[PDB]
Design a protein around this nucleic acid. Structure first.
Ligand SMILES: *C#CCN1CCOC1=O
Lengths: 56, 58
DNA sequence: TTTTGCCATGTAATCCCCGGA
DNA sequence: ATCCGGGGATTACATGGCAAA
């Protein structure tokens, strides 16, 4: 299990805010810009959507 | 990868009879049906999956 | 208060379901 | 049969915050 830095979380949240689903291109770009693997970016967005859904 | 199998006419008759009642398999139903037919549970759930797609097309 | 102990909560990652191709 | 990309439900585990002598 990896813990994301606040700079990564900040960027992921802004990105989520603009578009809550990734394209392949964007997942690849985000992974490259943040120093993360595409599976981590994919997992984060998935979990975030679920977390919001569980509130309402 | 999982091997492709062939279903006997008796296995097909039984799968279709179940499918005619309910196009979706619960866990219990899949275990029961796979055990009765001598089929891997993955072949059973895969046949139901594929039958739903064929029917949505036809 | 300290500082020691345990457990609730958050969350990354997994598992399994579906339709579509 | 495969593989993908959703979803819901979980599991595993690390930290937080609170209990208590
Ligand atoms: C479980 C989980 C999160 N992940 C990891 C790769 O794809 C995901 O959705």
């Amino acid at each position: 299990r990896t813990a994301f830095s606040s700079e990564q979380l900040a960027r992921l949240k802004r990105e989520f805010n603009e578009n809550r689903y990734l394209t392949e291109r964007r997942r690849q770009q985000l992974s490259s810009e943040l120093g993360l693997n595409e599976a981590q970016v994919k997992g984060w967005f998935k979990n975030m959507r679920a977390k919001i859904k569980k509130s309402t």
